[PDB]
Enzyme design. Structure first.
Site, mmCIF file in Angstrom:
data_model
loop_
_atom_site.group_PDB
_atom_site.id
_atom_site.type_symbol
_atom_site.label_atom_id
_atom_site.label_comp_id
_atom_site.label_asym_id
_atom_site.label_seq_id
_atom_site.Cartn_x
_atom_site.Cartn_y
_atom_site.Cartn_z
ATOM 1 N N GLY A 1 0.771 -1.120 0.059
ATOM 2 C CA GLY A 1 -0.150 -0.092 0.123
ATOM 3 C C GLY A 1 0.774 1.385 -0.006
ATOM 4 N N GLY B 1 1.963 2.621 -2.469
ATOM 5 C CA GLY B 1 1.659 3.324 -3.744
ATOM 6 C C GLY B 1 2.639 3.336 -4.923
ATOM 7 N N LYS B 2 3.191 2.152 -5.241
ATOM 8 C CA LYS B 2 4.171 1.896 -6.053
ATOM 9 C C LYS B 2 3.508 1.872 -7.558
ATOM 10 C CE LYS B 2 4.821 -1.898 -3.939
ATOM 11 N NZ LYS B 2 4.192 -1.801 -2.679
ATOM 12 N N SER B 3 2.378 1.039 -7.925
ATOM 13 C CA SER B 3 1.942 1.042 -8.877
ATOM 14 C C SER B 3 1.232 2.351 -9.364
ATOM 15 C CB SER B 3 0.691 0.086 -8.857
ATOM 16 O OG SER B 3 1.289 -1.054 -8.245
ATOM 17 N N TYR B 4 0.772 3.426 -8.127
ATOM 18 C CA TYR B 4 0.347 4.655 -8.319
ATOM 19 C C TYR B 4 1.455 5.566 -8.920
ATOM 20 C CZ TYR B 4 -1.314 9.348 -7.323
ATOM 21 O OH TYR B 4 -1.713 10.539 -7.590
ATOM 22 N N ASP C 1 7.624 -2.436 -11.493
ATOM 23 C CA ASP C 1 6.526 -2.277 -10.638
ATOM 24 C C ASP C 1 6.652 -3.618 -9.573
ATOM 25 O OD1 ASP C 1 4.885 -1.433 -8.578
ATOM 26 O OD2 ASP C 1 3.339 -1.393 -10.047
ATOM 27 N N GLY D 1 4.609 -5.624 -2.832
ATOM 28 C CA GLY D 1 4.878 -5.115 -1.460
ATOM 29 C C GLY D 1 5.265 -6.252 -0.457
HETATM 30 N N1 LIG Z 1 0.777 10.290 -3.842
HETATM 31 C C1 LIG Z 1 -0.419 9.847 -3.769
HETATM 32 N N2 LIG Z 1 -1.626 10.489 -4.092
HETATM 33 C C2 LIG Z 1 -2.951 9.921 -4.133
HETATM 34 N N3 LIG Z 1 -3.223 8.823 -3.753
HETATM 35 C C3 LIG Z 1 -2.149 7.852 -3.481
HETATM 36 C C4 LIG Z 1 -0.889 8.278 -3.609
HETATM 37 N N4 LIG Z 1 -0.128 7.233 -3.300
HETATM 38 C C5 LIG Z 1 -0.712 6.410 -2.995
HETATM 39 N N5 LIG Z 1 -1.967 6.459 -3.167
HETATM 40 C C6 LIG Z 1 -3.279 5.604 -3.068
HETATM 41 O O1 LIG Z 1 -2.455 4.356 -2.690
HETATM 42 C C7 LIG Z 1 -3.443 3.134 -3.309
HETATM 43 C C8 LIG Z 1 -2.657 2.079 -3.396
HETATM 44 O O2 LIG Z 1 -1.468 2.336 -4.319
HETATM 45 P P1 LIG Z 1 -0.523 1.209 -5.214
HETATM 46 O O3 LIG Z 1 0.285 1.890 -6.016
HETATM 47 O O4 LIG Z 1 -1.915 0.297 -5.737
HETATM 48 O O5 LIG Z 1 -0.194 0.363 -3.911
HETATM 49 P P2 LIG Z 1 0.893 -0.955 -4.477
HETATM 50 O O6 LIG Z 1 2.181 -0.629 -3.795
HETATM 51 O O7 LIG Z 1 0.057 -2.050 -3.331
HETATM 52 O O8 LIG Z 1 0.534 -1.150 -5.756
HETATM 53 C C9 LIG Z 1 -4.047 3.831 -4.377
HETATM 54 O O9 LIG Z 1 -5.431 3.441 -4.338
HETATM 55 C C10 LIG Z 1 -3.737 5.341 -4.371
HETATM 56 O O10 LIG Z 1 -4.974 6.059 -4.595
#
Ligand SMILES: Nc1ncnc2c1ncn2[C@@H]1O[C@H](COP(=O)(O)OP(=O)(O)O)[C@@H](O)[C@H]1O
Ligand SMILES: Nc1ncnc2c1ncn2[C@@H]1O[C@H](COP(=O)(O)OP(=O)(O)O)[C@@H](O)[C@H]1O
Lengths: 365, 368
Positions: free
Chosen positions: B98, B100-103, B251, B254
């Protein structure tokens, strides 16, 4: 001396070969014909006396019909006008371009018509009414060591080609008993005889072509030159004669890659034996010219026996081989390249012209 | 090989989550600009870390806010510059669940990540330098790691109870590791890139968990291959000097504890596999950081497909950048600390990058 001028004609690609994109295996480096199998394995190299690169009309040293004529045949004419004998052999497989070299087409004529017309022209230049010339010709074949006449009117029946026999005159040498001879004054009266003979010459359909040659053919032109001395004593007695022989030879033909039986088999065996004996004769003549006297086995074949006086002594011999550069006929071209050769053929490996992308040793240096 | 390119590390603090608001979590990560300070909530002990770059996406209106495009223009654009120069480039993410790597890498449709900006800027830069001297050729691939197996994301499956055809990895003596059978697609424009990316992300495996309702349960590698075919002043053939560059954007998944995201079966299995891969990656980073200090060390590349296929990026021959993603919640302070420790350990990595002229041992070698 009396040396043997061996020559080779590398035919260019034909339309069928260019459409099939048949790749090239026979290359030249000037004084060498090289064969590089598409597998890039033993690379053969042959050094002849004269190489005729008729492959591409814009390459240096392009062997035109006139070039080939002036290179090989004209010295035989100059020799014949001295009172000596000449022989020109033509060897090649079918489709290698042998008739193109010897006879020619309606255009781009070959050795036969070029030699004939130049001969008649020099005769005209040398005519004076003090010196006279006479031309008499014959045309025959050899089939299973039996002689047949080609200029004889024959019908259709079984076993009609009556065989003649060879006989040895103590002075004039060997000849054919009963062979006809006809007098000529131009080439237009030779063509109609040759076209009569080449229809009676033996042929048969085989795995190489539906009309292949299966008998050796000899066209002999006998020139007689008469002179007169001004001493009021030698009335038309100074005679000197010469013989020009033009011999179309048949191909070897391996009986392994052509499942045959009966008459075709017999024909192949006879042709093969004749070619072997001819090769022995030519090699022994080369050794004789290079000094070591030897024995020429003239008597082991009708062809050599009849041509004895035209392949020895003060005479001139030439052998034109014809080879194709396509990779589709490696065995025949190598067979024709291994045959027509007096020196030793060399073999190596030369796939290392791809050392580093057009070697580029310029950098190393 | 006359260079030493240090791996460039960045950090990104994400904002509070729905979960971390429902649970009244505090703030424990702070910045003073370029440094990153972390505090235990017990007021016992403070730690500080320093990186080449640090981003702050905790709140939109705060000072120093590094938005998505700012993160791009700080990290990914120089990688495009080196890709045009002729170097291979790598950018890979790291962090806990969680974070936010994929984001940060791909993003959402209304907030495109690093990939849809990198490829677009690439095509745009090409449109200004597609002159008569030089032409360009672009291929793409996008592959997935799931339970230590390799899958292709840019094919349309058949229809069965099993339609994940696994590929295998191989080791070419010169080019290094690669994937046998991977569809490499020739690309023409950013719209085609976007179509392929949509297909791949729809094919990628996801699942609802206790920390991500849309979880990234498989590692993802996005490879671009760019070939610039240039021309010398020639008396003969034009277009006779080519330079290649591989861009790998990665990507990763976690850590994820099994007790927090309580779920049994396939979720647990793939979480275990993810955990193993992350452990091996950590060992690799530590071993390279120890190589940087002059010791003879062995890098366990072969213990996992991920590091095995990324052998040339974590070390080897390419210019590499790392993006650690962290959360400011106090409940995840331990995982934040582990991520930051591995990240600052990664700054000591040194890779020997070279230009891929494809002219050495041909002519430019002895030219110079
Ligand atoms: N800088 C940010 N701004 C807005 N939302 C964020 C940010 N960073 C993370 N998130 C939130 O965190 C959630 C998970 O991000 P994701 O990249 O899917 O995590 P993971 O590492 O599990 O892939 C997303 O739904 C996103 O909305
Ligand atoms: N110098 C040349 N240039 C172009 N084509 C040639 C040349 N020599 C021979 N040929 C080709 O070879 C063919 C003759 O082959 P063919 O007479 O069937 O073989 P053979 O002479 O052994 O009977 C001709 O059709 C001709 O196109």
């Amino acid at each position: 001396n009396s040396q043997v001028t061996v020559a080779v004609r590398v035919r260019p690609f034909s339309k069928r070969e260019k459409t099939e994109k048949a790749s090239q295996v026979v290359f030249t480096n000037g004084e060498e014909i090289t064969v590089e199998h598409p597998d890039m394995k033993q690379v053969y190299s042959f050094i002849y006396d004269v190489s005729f690169w008729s492959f591409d009309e814009c390459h240096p040293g392009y062997a035109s019909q006139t070039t080939v004529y002036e290179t090989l045949a004209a010295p035989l004419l100059d020799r014949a006008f001295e009172g000596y004998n000449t022989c020109l052999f033509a060897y090649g497989q079918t489709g290698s371009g042998k008739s193109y070299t010897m006879m020619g087409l309606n255009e781009e004529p070959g050795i036969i018509p070029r030699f004939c017309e130049d001969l008649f022209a020099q005769i005209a230049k040398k005519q004076t009414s003090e010196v006279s010339y006479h031309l008499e010709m014959s045309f025959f074949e050899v089939y299973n060591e039996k002689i047949h006449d080609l200029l004889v009117c024959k019908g259709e029946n079984g076993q009609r080609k009556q065989p003649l026999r060879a006989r040895e005159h103590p002075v004039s040498g060997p000849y054919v008993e009963g062979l006809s001879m006809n007098v000529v004054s131009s080439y237009s009266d030779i063509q109609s005889w040759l076209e009569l003979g080449n229809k009676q010459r033996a042929t048969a359909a085989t795995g190489m072509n539906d009309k292949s040659s299966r008998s050796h053919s000899v066209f002999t032109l006998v020139m007689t030159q008469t002179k007169t001395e001004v001493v009021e004593g030698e009335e038309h007695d100074h005679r000197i004669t010469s013989r020009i022989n033009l011999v179309d030879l048949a191909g070897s033909e391996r009986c392994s890659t052509a499942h045959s039986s009966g008459q075709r088999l017999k024909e192949g065996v006879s042709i093969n034996k004749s070619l072997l004996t001819l090769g022995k004769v030519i090699s022994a003549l080369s050794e004789q010219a290079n000094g070591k006297r030897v024995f020429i086995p003239y008597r082991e074949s009708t062809l050599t026996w009849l041509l004895k006086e035209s392949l020895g002594g003060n005479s001139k011999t030439a052998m034109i081989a014809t080879v194709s550069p396509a990779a589709s006929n490696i065995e025949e071209t190598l067979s024709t390249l291994r045959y027509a050769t007096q020196a030793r053929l060399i073999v190596n490996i030369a796939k290392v012209n791809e050392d580093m992308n057009a070697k580029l040793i310029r950098e190393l240096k």
